[PDB]
């Protein structure tokens, strides 16, 4: 799989478990077309979202449902969700890890792009 | 000034100047209506986006045009933009500062909410 | 004011108030000599630590007492403190803002260096 | 191994490879005693630093030589190094991952503590 999502919890110092993640691909008419989704595992990771054959060049949006995550922990959050929007490019390395570090009023995200 | 945006550059250790910012508000029909836009000053700050009267309750999206920023500096970055999505003024008027710290393959964002 | 420290709380979405900060400078004998100290205000800022005359070239350590901050709020955090270590004024006098964003098991820090 | 260090590069969107890491344990006289060290791998990770038997409760410092890393890439950095100082506690989960995300004028660090 060319796309993995990893989510961490900066309040508890843990993986962020059972977080819903939705991936969209930008269509020709600039709408967001559902592409893949899942929930992070006990290690905070979401594997197997797509395949090399399906993951063609284009703009993708990864939506991480941070609000539901914080509410399930009894914590009041700021954001509706975290969004990561990027272009997949065949010129670069083949594997994309989208990582996010979550706090109630803040988040960080980085891309780790490797061969 | 109930909505302010502040952007920093983590490569240069400086304000991120001339960063375009577009704000949207979710409409009754569930689309993103353009609400306000502007660009960061030499201090990396964007003031005057809206007014207390105009900044009513709603779900807002602050889109920070990070790709256009990096590309204007001769850099090819990872993200298209940073999107900050939040419910505002649910418990009455507040003042919101949306801060963002930018790197070519990573960003963080935090909200400072007062009064 | 050539050295300023600003601290934010990522759990509350607020300035981090009453955070103790201790600054050290590496001595000729390679030990950390106490240089200045203070605490953040209601704005999360710490001004007046030093003067242009006193803030000479050197290697400085800014220790932000994050554990004491979280514990004063009834929270058991991970880190003892955040340490920011840097060479200052190597190319002549500059103004340094050390910013830190705090969560119980995570922090970030960035420097804004001007003139 | 109860202690792992992971380092990421926010400029290149990659693991931070061949970064020197030094771990110290705080001695009874408040000095820092060398404990373990190594260099991050091609995946940006440093495994096998210590064992369960050696990693007793106490205060530890993880020093990440960020300055040499940026210089080897031809980039001018701000910090001398990144420091992560924490107490190992047997009450919590047994495995500590210290992660750091590096930019030239900024870094983030979080702890992922698991069983
Ligand atoms: O999101 C951030 C915002 C800020 C910041 C820094 C200075 C301000 O006057 C306002 C906000 O610093 C930071 C420092 C970091 O290391 C990481 C951040 O996300 C931020
Ligand atoms: O976005 C982040 C991702 C990670 C990370 C941690 C472990 C992985 O296997 C992959 C990514 O650590 C971090 C540590 C930080 O202090 C801040 C981050 O944004 C991240």
Question: Is A103 at the interface with chain B, CB within 8 A?
Answer: yes
| Spatial separation of the C-alpha atoms in residues C45 and A93, rounded to whole Å | 42
| Spatial separation of the C-alpha atoms in residues D85 and D13, rounded to whole Å | 26
Identify residues after which chain A is interrupted (C–N over 2.5 A). none
What tokens appear for A49 in the block? 């979202």
Among candidate residues A60, A75, A72, A61, the one with its CA nearest the CA of residue A106:
A75
Please give the DSSP secondary-structure letter assigned to residue B44. Answer: S
CA pseudo-torsion sign B9, B12, B14, B19: negative
Among candidate residues D101, D21, A19, the one with its CA nearest the CA of residue B104:
D101
Among candidate residues C35, C2, C20, the one with its CA nearest the CA of residue C80:
C20
What tokens appear for D73 in the block? 């890439």
Q: How far is CA C50 from CA B32, C2, C35, C38, in A?
A: 48, 7, 8, 10
Please give the DSSP secondary-structure letter assigned to residue B80. Answer: E
Q: Do C72 and C20 meet the contact criterion of CB atoms below 8 Å apart?
A: no
Among candidate residues A46, A89, A43, A90, the one with its CA nearest the CA of residue A64:
A46
Q: Do C76 and C70 meet the contact criterion of CB atoms below 8 Å apart?
A: yes
What tokens appear for D19 in the block? 């970064």
Please give the DSSP secondary-structure letter assigned to residue C57. Answer: S
**Strand, helix or coil at A67?**
helix
Please give the DSSP secondary-structure letter assigned to residue C70. Answer: H
Among candidate residues D70, B7, B10, the one with its CA nearest the CA of residue C111:
B10
H or E element that contains C69: helix C66-72
Domain count of the fold of chain D: 1
Q: How far is CA C89 from CA B11, C22, D103, in A?
A: 19, 19, 20
What is the residue-wise DSSP string for B21-36?
A: EEEEEE-TTS-EEEEE
At residue D72, φ and ψ (nearest 5 deg) are: -70, -20
Please give the DSSP secondary-structure letter assigned to residue D59. Answer: E
| Spatial separation of the C-alpha atoms in residues B63 and A55, rounded to whole Å | 25
Quote the domain boundaries for residue B95: 1-115
Q: Is C6 in the pocket of ligand 1 (CB under 6 A)?
A: yes
Measured at the alpha carbon of residue A108, what is the angle toward residues A17 and D111, in degrees to the nearest 5? 60
Among candidate residues B11, B30, B13, the one with its CA nearest the CA of residue B74:
B11
Task: Tell whether C45 is in a known binding site.
Answer: yes
**What's the full length of chain D, in residues?**
115
Q: Do C80 and D87 meet the contact criterion of CB atoms below 8 Å apart?
A: yes
**Strand, helix or coil at C47?**
coil
Q: How far is CA A42 from CA A8, A19, B94, C42, in A?
A: 11, 10, 37, 39
Q: Which residue has the tokens 């300055």?
A: D67
Cβ-Cβ pairs closer than 8 A, B with D, add up to: 37
**Strand, helix or coil at A58?**
strand
β-pairing, A95-103 with A3-9?
Answer: parallel
Measured at the alpha carbon of residue C56, what is the angle toward residues C55 and C60, in degrees to the nearest 5? 75
What is the residue-wise DSSP string for C16-43?
A: -TT-EEEEEEE-TTS-EEEEEEEE--TT
Q: Is A59 exposed, middle or buried (0-12, 13-18, 19+ CB in 10 A)?
A: middle
| Spatial separation of the C-alpha atoms in residues A48 and A94, rounded to whole Å | 15
Q: How far is B78 from chain D (nearest CA, A)?
A: 8
**Strand, helix or coil at D97?**
strand
Number of continuous H segments (helices) and E segments (strands) in chain C: 1, 9
What tokens appear for B64 in the block? 């920070």
β-pairing, C79-88 with D79-88?
Answer: antiparallel
Dihedral of CA atoms D64, D66, D68, D72 in degrees, nearest 10, equals 130
Instruction: Tell me the CA end-to-end span of chain C in Å, nearest whole number.
Output: 13
**Strand, helix or coil at A63?**
strand
Q: How far is CA C40 from CA A36, C48, D7, D71, D93, in A?
A: 45, 11, 30, 33, 33
| Spatial separation of the C-alpha atoms in residues C62 and C37, rounded to whole Å | 9
The experimental technique behind this entry is X-ray
- Window 53-82 of B: residues touching A by CB (8 A cutoff) are 59, 78-81
Question: Is C41 at the interface with chain D, CB within 8 A?
Answer: no
Q: Do D96 and D62 meet the contact criterion of CB atoms below 8 Å apart?
A: no
| Spatial separation of the C-alpha atoms in residues C102 and A11, rounded to whole Å | 10
**What's the full length of chain C, in residues?**
115
What tokens appear for D9 in the block? 């590069």
Out of C5, C7, C10, C110, give the residue to mutate to test ligand 1, the one with the largest number of ligand atoms within 8 Å of its CB.
C110
What tokens appear for A7 in the block? 């989510």
CATH code (residue C98): 2.60.40.180
Q: Do A33 and A27 meet the contact criterion of CB atoms below 8 Å apart?
A: yes
What is the residue-wise DSSP string for D65-87?
A: -HHHHHHHTT---SEEEEEEEEE
Q: How far, in Å, is the centroid of ligand 2 from the Cα of C55? A: 35
CA pseudo-torsion sign D60, A98, D67, C50: negative
């Amino acid at each position: 799989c060319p796309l993995m999502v990893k989510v961490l919890d900066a309040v508890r110092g843990s993986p962020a478990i059972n977080v819903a993640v939705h991936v969209f691909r930008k269509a020709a008419d600039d709408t967001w077309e559902p592409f893949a989704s899942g929930k992070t595992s006990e290690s905070g990771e979401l594997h197997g979202l797509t395949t090399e054959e399906e993951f063609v060049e284009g703009i993708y949006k990864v939506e991480i449902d941070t609000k539901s995550y914080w509410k399930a922990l009894g914590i009041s959050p700021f954001h509706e969700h975290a969004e990561v929007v990027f272009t997949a490019n065949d010129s670069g390395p083949r594997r994309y890890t989208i990582a996010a570090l979550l706090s109630p009023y803040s988040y960080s995200t980085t891309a780790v792009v490797t061969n």
